Amino acid sequence: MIRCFITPDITSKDCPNGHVCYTKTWCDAFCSIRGKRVDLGCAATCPTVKTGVDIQCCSTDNCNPFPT
Structure with a gap:
């Protein structure tokens, strides 16, 4: 049980x-724009x-906010 x-x-x-929150980031074909x-x-x-x-x-709860 976790909030994310x-x-x-x-x-x-x-x-x-x-049990975990995560943030994944990657480049797709439009990364450059x-x-x-x-x-x-x-x-x-x-x-x-x-x-x-x-x-x-x-x-921890909500530990993956959108990057700023």
Whole structure:
């Protein structure tokens, strides 16, 4: 059970089976004009990410706000 921010809307949700919040960022084909993609979510464990995807995982409520 954890509360986290969730994309795409960027609002907080209860995740009854979650234990971490995460922020994933990466470049898609439009990175050069729109900036990085940002995924905010909750998971039972910190996700395993592939090359090109940055991730930050934390375990307190709403610890993954949209980057400023």
